Design a protein around this motif. Sequence first.
Motif, PDB file in Angstrom:
ATOM      1  N   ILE A 113      38.499  28.622  34.025  1.00 12.48           N
ATOM      2  CA  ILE A 113      39.728  28.298  33.333  1.00 12.48           C
ATOM      3  C   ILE A 113      39.683  26.856  32.874  1.00 12.48           C
ATOM      4  CG2 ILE A 113      42.202  27.894  33.593  1.00 12.48           C
ATOM      5  CD1 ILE A 113      40.735  30.896  33.299  1.00 12.48           C
ATOM      6  N   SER A 164      44.125  33.058  30.746  1.00 15.21           N
ATOM      7  CA  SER A 164      44.245  33.579  32.098  1.00 15.21           C
ATOM      8  C   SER A 164      43.198  34.628  32.426  1.00 15.21           C
ATOM      9  CB  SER A 164      45.614  34.215  32.288  1.00 15.21           C
ATOM     10  OG  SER A 164      45.673  35.454  31.595  1.00 15.21           O
ATOM     11  N   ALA A 186      51.541  36.898  34.474  1.00 11.86           N
ATOM     12  CA  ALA A 186      50.536  36.911  35.522  1.00 11.86           C
ATOM     13  C   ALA A 186      51.186  36.875  36.890  1.00 11.86           C
ATOM     14  CB  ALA A 186      49.613  35.722  35.361  1.00 11.86           C
ATOM     15  N   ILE A 219      46.446  31.257  35.533  1.00 10.84           N
ATOM     16  CA  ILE A 219      46.984  31.162  34.193  1.00 10.84           C
ATOM     17  C   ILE A 219      47.228  29.696  33.855  1.00 10.84           C
ATOM     18  CG2 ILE A 219      49.345  31.424  35.027  1.00 10.84           C
ATOM     19  CD1 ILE A 219      49.736  33.122  32.328  1.00 10.84           C
TER      20      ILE A 219
END
Lengths: 244, 228
Positions: B174, B13, B114, B22
């Motif tokens: 990510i 994340s 998160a 995340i």
Amino acid sequence: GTGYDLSNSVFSPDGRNFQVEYAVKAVENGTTSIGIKCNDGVVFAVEKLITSKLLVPQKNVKIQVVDRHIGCVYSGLIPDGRHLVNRGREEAASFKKLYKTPIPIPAFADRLGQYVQAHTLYNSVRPFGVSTIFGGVDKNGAHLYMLEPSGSYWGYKGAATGKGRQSAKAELEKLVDHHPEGLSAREAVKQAAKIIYLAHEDNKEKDFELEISWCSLSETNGLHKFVKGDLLQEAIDFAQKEIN
Amino acid sequence: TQQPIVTGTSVISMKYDNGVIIAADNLGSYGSLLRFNGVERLIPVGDNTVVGISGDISDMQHIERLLKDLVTENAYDNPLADAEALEPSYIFEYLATVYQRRSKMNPLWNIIVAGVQSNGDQFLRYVNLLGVTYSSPTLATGFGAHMANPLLRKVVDRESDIPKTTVQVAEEAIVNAMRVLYYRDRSSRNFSLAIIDKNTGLTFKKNLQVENMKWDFAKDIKGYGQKI
């Protein structure tokens, strides 16, 4: 002799438990509240006497939720009512924790049932000073219940307790007859607002504040939610109109 | 004291200008056996928080039940349950409190909480079986700490770089990381990704897959030192 009414678990010569009966008095002396079972949920509503202009409106809430699908309202000694809900809340968490599924209304009823009945067995405790109307929607339908200080309780189509339980019950009985097919969540919400208004006559001296909540498989997805804003006003008016 | 049986790998994340992202694959390993593939390791709490758990799956499932209860209980006698409601910082401080277990020598095991927050701020903090906690623009657990952080820190090296980072830039980093990881890690190709934006709200993506992988060059490699 006499004195059979000074200790809680004592049986009087005619087989009664006077302390429990005296508890009922405390209940009848309290605000009126009701419950209406509809075709897919239940509605709760209660009277809130405006003792003064100092009472912040809409704040001092009375109806309580248990878990996410149970709604509880009671008449009598408010503190005692909270106590009973705290228990019910644990009673519910415990059930869910072990069985995963949220507690069935009937199952929940007996939990409160057994616990209240328990407070009539010993002279070291006082019976509950409240009658409670609670219910919700579960795996198979909606269920409405009312519990007496005696721990007694049954399933209802409509139920009421408190100062104007008679006015209410009167109204409720009408509804039951004039709707053999089943009322609707939307309908019941207004109907309830009315019945509170009518039943408020037995206390017409003080001004009150309305409070409603409901649990409908369709209108709330089976979750207990409070009736606010528009839908509340709409029902407040529906009553204000037929009160004249 | 115990030992983990069914487990979940990394949880990566980072936080961009408007929120946080995340992600976590959907695998449930049992030793070296990749036993379960439909494991969601991202627990959303409300609509402003998502909790990513790695470690013992059985303990994770416990932590899940804990969260669902935190929700239920917060609703009790709370008329502002959907207004002035659970904050990510609340959810975290609670879970972190639940140190403890390590302090009772019975840890758990396993977390990255998160979310955004009510005042718009981004929340990203970490806590593990030892009860250790910390925050950073990017956070990864287990393997991701070794391979993902390096990439994500390229991006957001310091604080700043946050406002300068867009959701696309971030989600890209990510998704790339998830591919890396699949290349070197007890990882799965299938994963879940969640974005919590202070405007768009909570976006929870399911069934994503690692794509655009370079494997071709493998054909040119024969032997371990052999010409054919």
